[PDB]
Design an enzyme around this catalytic site. Structure first.
Site, PDB file in Angstrom:
ATOM      1  N   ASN D  45       3.736   7.402   6.567  1.00  0.00           N
ATOM      2  CA  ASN D  45       3.915   6.079   5.983  1.00  0.00           C
ATOM      3  C   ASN D  45       2.883   5.095   6.538  1.00  0.00           C
ATOM      4  O   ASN D  45       2.425   5.233   7.680  1.00  0.00           O
ATOM      5  CB  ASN D  45       5.363   5.565   6.080  1.00  0.00           C
ATOM      6  N   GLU D  47       2.361   1.002   6.518  1.00  0.00           N
ATOM      7  CA  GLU D  47       3.023  -0.250   6.189  1.00  0.00           C
ATOM      8  C   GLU D  47       2.052  -1.424   6.040  1.00  0.00           C
ATOM      9  O   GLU D  47       0.867  -1.325   6.378  1.00  0.00           O
ATOM     10  CB  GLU D  47       4.144  -0.549   7.196  1.00  0.00           C
ATOM     11  N   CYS D  56       4.598   5.484   1.340  1.00  0.00           N
ATOM     12  CA  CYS D  56       5.365   6.541   1.985  1.00  0.00           C
ATOM     13  C   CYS D  56       4.519   7.758   2.334  1.00  0.00           C
ATOM     14  O   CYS D  56       3.491   8.018   1.693  1.00  0.00           O
ATOM     15  CB  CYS D  56       6.480   6.993   1.057  1.00  0.00           C
ATOM     16  N   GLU D  58       5.102  11.033   1.842  1.00  0.00           N
ATOM     17  CA  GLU D  58       5.008  12.010   0.756  1.00  0.00           C
ATOM     18  C   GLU D  58       3.841  11.632  -0.160  1.00  0.00           C
ATOM     19  O   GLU D  58       3.016  12.478  -0.529  1.00  0.00           O
ATOM     20  CB  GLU D  58       6.303  12.040  -0.076  1.00  0.00           C
ATOM     21  N   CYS D  91      12.573   8.790  -0.975  1.00  0.00           N
ATOM     22  CA  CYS D  91      12.920   7.678  -1.852  1.00  0.00           C
ATOM     23  C   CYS D  91      12.595   8.008  -3.307  1.00  0.00           C
ATOM     24  O   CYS D  91      11.836   8.946  -3.603  1.00  0.00           O
ATOM     25  CB  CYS D  91      12.213   6.383  -1.411  1.00  0.00           C
ATOM     26  N   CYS D  94       8.856   8.099  -4.354  1.00  0.00           N
ATOM     27  CA  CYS D  94       8.278   9.385  -3.948  1.00  0.00           C
ATOM     28  C   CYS D  94       8.688  10.555  -4.831  1.00  0.00           C
ATOM     29  O   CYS D  94       7.868  11.425  -5.115  1.00  0.00           O
ATOM     30  CB  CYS D  94       8.598   9.709  -2.487  1.00  0.00           C
TER      31      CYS D  94
END
Ligand SMILES: [Zn+2]
Ligand SMILES: [Zn+2]
Ligand SMILES: [Zn+2]
Ligand SMILES: [Zn+2]
Lengths: 133, 127, 127, 133
Positions: D45, D47, D56, D58, D91, D94
């Protein structure tokens, strides 16, 4: 939603769809969200020349309701409509937002422009959903 | 409608924010050319990339009501920042398309500090 | 590393784009302070809001390799635009955080038009 | 992936996780993607102060592989790891990207930092997924 039928909520979602701003995909989507106290919020997709900035109808409806002072868990049902073969499938981003703002038990009414309907829940659309406690 | 009235509307909008992750509430108030006001607040998500900003919440709401790009007069934005709140790049990209470069942007905080700019000034040589 | 070489790397990156919805391929090439190059391309999705830009693809790749914010020298970006391609607000927000305001941004097209700027210049009074 | 065990892929996802840039959530996630020809891509991830620009693990892994010239359907498996009670749940965003880039049959290995593992697919994570033909 004693006073809001699935038919009426679908009709509101189609009315919402007409206001979409989708000159890039030319794919209009509408949503209608009904709250705990029976208020209806329209949502439509709103596109941008930079595609990553596009927003979906489901999220537009929910963000609008939040801006009006509705809080997570205060929604009874959401209807979503597009020009699809079967009932329109919410994208994964919308499912994640729906589960957080509507909770797993939010009733989701999916439809198209040809009378095809399926009723599901935010939880069913996103099994074993990601949460941050 | 005065700038003061628009700022007050943005402050009212801010109270309705959903920001349990950052604990940082933002409000926006958008006025259309025909005088209708739309509130916007940030709405966060456990998946951070799905967070939505106040400015975008207000604009998306106005579009959903049937307003079209270029039919807006100004947007006010407010948060508890040191100086006037700075809109993020994502909001700037949406403001320029839906508001046009000439959209007036009134930036403020919870202490009375104000800066007025335009969507175009915030995003030079835009996409 | 020359600007010409960085631009050529961005053109090579562009070829690997996944853009079946816009049919508009973008490439980026990011060079670190210690001279490693990372390719980026746009990667689209049926859900448009999930599309990722070339600039961000390159920066995310460099972070995933272990580079930290501020450890980059320059980024080149290229597409088939009339003038040098203009990065969107979202990319500008990511570039300023991961590249710092002083990050050199080399914008170009497929016709040889070039403009050099910085992350800070692209996003005045940033968040 | 004859030469890549689930255990090996998880170990790569944990190594990926160490490189996360998450000073806002302080919640580091890692992913490791193995391609048709056995190449492994790390994702973590990344940010941003404006939360809506966070990416993210993935998606970082998949975008990196795409930038290297891998195309939709060229992925064998992805492992995802975080500091969660059960195996980490991807999520919805993703899941939408995984289904488009990996196809419904992509093998998804979910784990945490305590040895809990479940194996699923991109299609199972996102039932009746949204597509644009
Ligand atoms: Zn969606
Ligand atoms: Zn913003
Ligand atoms: Zn961009
Ligand atoms: Zn995710």
């Amino acid at each position: 939603h004693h006073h809001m039928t699935h038919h009426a909520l679908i009709e509101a979602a189609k009315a919402a769809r007409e206001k979409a701003y989708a000159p890039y995909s030319n794919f209009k989507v509408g949503a209608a969200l009904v709250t705990n106290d029976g208020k209806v919020f329209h949502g439509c997709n709103v596109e941008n020349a930079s595609y990553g900035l596009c927003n979906c109808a489901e999220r537009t409806a929910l963000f609008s309701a939040l801006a009006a002072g509705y809080r997570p868990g205060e929604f009874a049902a959401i209807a979503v409509v597009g020009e699809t073969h079967g009932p329109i499938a919410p994208c994964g981003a919308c499912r994640q937002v729906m589960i957080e703002l509507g909770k797993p038990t939010l009733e989701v009414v999916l439809t198209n422009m040809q009378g095809d309907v399926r009723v599901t829940s935010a939880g069913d659309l996103l099994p074993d959903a990601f949460y941050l406690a």
